[PDB]
């Protein structure tokens, strides 16, 4: 629901005291999927034919 509840989840209690309480971990998850392999790799003779 909220980070105030994440504090009560990471530390088993309901009355939270005043302070910086570590709760979780951020991890930017990847957006795109880039897969680059080599250049050309055998060009076939469809040329001259067209």
């Amino acid at each position: 629901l909220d980070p105030l509840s994440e504090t009560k989840c990471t530390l088993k209690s309901f009355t939270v005291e005043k302070g910086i309480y570590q709760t979780s971990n951020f991890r930017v998850q990847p957006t795109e999927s880039i897969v680059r392999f080599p250049n050309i790799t055998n060009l076939c003779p469809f040329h001259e034919v067209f």
């Binding site: 005043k18 302070g19 570590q22 951020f26 080599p38």
Partner: protein, 220 residues
Amino acid sequence: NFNGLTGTGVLTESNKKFLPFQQFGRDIADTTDAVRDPQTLEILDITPCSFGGVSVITPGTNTSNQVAVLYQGVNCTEVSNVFQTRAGCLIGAEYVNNSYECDIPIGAGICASYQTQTSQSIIAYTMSLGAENSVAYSNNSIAIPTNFTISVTTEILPVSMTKTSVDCTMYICGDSTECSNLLLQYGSFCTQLKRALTGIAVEQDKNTQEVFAQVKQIYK
């Protein structure tokens, strides 16, 4: 996945002089930094995906319920007021130009507090080290006190802990002779642990004795 190398990372242009035969590219902890584009022969550096740690600043449920989240390490451009302190992106507080005492330590000088600005909102500010006191330093001036104030301060110092002793064969193995047999193979560890616990207990007793039992006559 540059010609096989499979990693997740922010790929940015670099300046590395790669020698014309080197392909991957590593570091001093055996990671996998720079990668050379299979196609366009440029050298781009991989830099770890912006990860960090979430820290929720709470002024206490008794006071209120408004909290602020601190994203340690992140740069705000990687995810209400958003201030970038050198200890993280603090989302949920506004940076006041004033200076007060440090209530909740944020990091790198920044400190947070729940204040009724002009209305209760978590604020952020630079902690003040105290009040500037300019003492006169004339060549022929001295300050001599005229009165005194006897002050009785208090200091809390621990002496001993709770003397604990575990039943190794009973804790590690329940009431299972099968299990007891396989611990006898794990060696002489239970003996060392029991010796350490007995030493801790005797040490706590000696600490109590040397702290409180310092006199011989019991005065009344």
